């Protein structure tokens, strides 16, 4: 990878240890993957925030930067924190303060594009959080690799990322066609479609046919699920995503998704209500329409839930929910909007044994952690819950 | 023995016993950073330790925070001696880089089987099976 | 225009006066413009909110709907309110309550796409507010006509809009090429570029060449200015907007914008500081990066302004500014973030005589209202102000 | 006299004196709803009243709230008797529709001049100049 004279000086340490540590990560990556140069990025999104995920070793890694006075040189937003007991939260506050000290916007949400950091079509950025990578590449047509937490941080500090991978036109072409014969209409339908496709494909850029989502949040969930059971960073949907019309430049194979594929996932996430002690909506963090939907479903139920419902969402969405009166409605029925946080990355083993959700990403992770899981559309969960 | 030629991800040299999985792996969720024991309930090597071994798997999946799990494994001295993958994406590469774990990709991993002794010349991207 | 049996019954009054009144507006429009049918819309954005703009006649028009129990049948957001004395605000609250009663999200912002209502590429919607029309068509590649306030409301109630105009592929093609030879780099550069182009073109879909904006907010302002001095609802920018690659399907004329064109606009908005008694940023409503920029400029100035600075912004952005600490910083230096409101649509004649701003849309309207106007980039305004 | 054939926007029939502008017009900012007096500081007919006249202009510009200004003009009985434009966009059409102001577009407005007497047959889109 070519470096400018200024970048060579940064690598050499002429501008201090913090920039040099970040540059060393970016140079290693660009050299591995054959990047011609570093390109500037318009923003970063940094994952690796919950103390459960990064531990004391993660705190040490960040303190190494912070003690050298590290500061991000581009606009940078931040993924959500975990929730836990007093000892956990003390550690969790330590992490957030380390990120704050580097000049990052402590937004604590996996949906920064809801008011904090919205990439434009064609923008080169360096984002981790796999569902936000998928959203930015696929739904908005921005350009980012599936960054590791630390490589997004390194890019934020240098203000540049290596020019390889999804930054290049040729790596944004479809590699396979997915013909969705299955009936896919609801949020939870898209959850299990993404669950299936992520683990069926490899490192692919799928082109979806016969898929007409009513709501953007359906594609948000599709990308989130495929980035959990698989490694999908970019996909195309015919008529629905901005890069679809030049996505196919080769003769490609077609896989088809049938009802039987989706039934299999649904039937494996159907633990009994007697094993569920919370409902979780908002993985990735809920949009304001998602919050509105739940307020309406709770008022139609007309009696409070006897297990708690939690809606994880961005600060922006939480504030809109407060201002428009949805928060008060939802709390009337034993629901709560939890800003800034994520339950999947929280050590809640001893607090909850079973989670009902409409999110395929949450269902996948909670199952792999040993929880009971019921996956269903939120209207069914709210109607049937105790 | 036979040589498999691939791509350097992180340099270094290592020799040891191979432990092979045929399923994509997410270190966040798939490996306990405290122990090095695979914790994926659907891994074909669930319950086995990767610490001090040569870990083979086809490709990563899942969380972009996997890089931090790899780093925590290394700091707990429970990380593999080296890692051989079919294709290494940014998340996995980044974990190896910050953890200084020798790593190669582009290897035909179907030719590796559990229990083999191997030399990994990560600087040159080469894996040698020891007979 | 073809109507389904259900739509014919609505037109006939079978489902009540409110739906029939809305349908009559949509049928008249579709018949004028040769629409084949009504198509469903995924959302609406409704302008005509400030009491100064709509008056008692506007209140009567809305009450006609509300007294018949009108309710929007799709997700609908709302443009900003005005600010004034006690009598004005009583009337202003009346308007907002009328919209609230129709089930509209009273978001009170011209930038609903910052967390409340983000259209997806290809989505058919019915939006008024000319800068948001421009944003949704041009930057996101959604599809909406330049709706009048009342036609967006009618569409929100029926949940459909007539299929003509910018909903059709053929009307999204470029009609003219704009070669920007002028140096255009800053926010205020884009303000005057849009001011000039809007009044130079007619009903056009311009394709911009040699224009590489560093920030999305630069294009937000470009579309806002062209929708004020002109009628531009959709434009393309080479490499930067999602529909650019198939925008040119004919041989087109090229106009060029030179430095002399932009100097002329700049030089006409340079009233003396002694005539200015407020600074206004956030037309259209400020993004969180815009708020961040101002906090940084005020801290570098290091002393309070002696005239007030106002930043109009969405509730979402205001809440992020509160949570991230920018509100406190800005208030230290005689700045304020004003949510839910717009100064251009406020009766502030007797409160302020002169407005300094970086917005070409604000500069145009305040000039036409008789105010003194100084147009400049916000860094220069903050450095030079008393 | 000579007939100019265009497109019906809002039906009705009217006859009166023409007042012509050659610049695009935004009713929000360009016309005072209380008086019917043009208030655009750069209009070629600034200061003149449109109330009760036949207003000619090439096309709208500016605010999507212009439809509400047209409606307020009509409710204050200060609106033109009819409007003739070169091209009528959604905002202007919508104002005429809710205000029941006869309106046509698609007319060669360069052939109309201030002070002419005209019949507008808006139902058929036709303008007739009266000699
Ligand atoms: C699994 C994942 O959602 C974990 C996020 O953890 P954190 O909030 O960034 O600490 C990250 C991803 O999917 O890339
Ligand atoms: C001029 C304009 O910004 C006025 C908006 O007024 P209101 O807040 O929707 O009442 C509308 C537009 O430009 O379309
Ligand atoms: S970070 Fe967000 S995408 Fe899901 S796993 Fe947590 S709510
Ligand atoms: S509505 Fe918004 S676009 Fe400007 S004129 Fe008012 S701040």
Author numbering:
A (entry chain A), C (entry chain A): 1 to 386
B (entry chain B), D (entry chain B): 0 to 130
Q: Mind quoting what the paper says about this structure?
A:
Aconitase superfamily members catalyze the homologous isomerization of specific substrates by sequential dehydration and hydration and contain a [4Fe-4S] cluster. However, monomeric and heterodimeric types of function unknown aconitase X (AcnX) have recently been characterized as a cis-3-hydroxy-L-proline dehydratase (AcnXType-I) and mevalonate 5-phosphate dehydratase (AcnXType-II), respectively. We herein elucidated the crystal structures of AcnXType-I from Agrobacterium tumefaciens (AtAcnX) and AcnXType-II from Thermococcus kodakarensis (TkAcnX) without a ligand and in complex with substrates. AtAcnX and TkAcnX contained the [2Fe-2S] and [3Fe-4S] clusters, respectively, conforming to UV and EPR spectroscopy analyses.
To clarify substrate binding, we directly co-crystallized the wild-type enzyme of TkAcnX (inactive form) with MVA5P, and the crystal structure was elucidated at a resolution of 1.9 Å. On the other hand, the two subunits were closely rotated by an angle of ~26°; substrate binding resulted in a more “closed” conformation than the structure in the apo-form. The hydroxyl group of MVA5P on C3 formed hydrogen bonds with the side chains of Glu129(L) and Lys361(L), among which the former interacted with the side chains of Asn79(L) and Ser131(L). In addition, Ser62(S) was close to C2 of MVA5P (a distance of 3.2 Å) and superimposed onto Ser70 in AtAcnX.
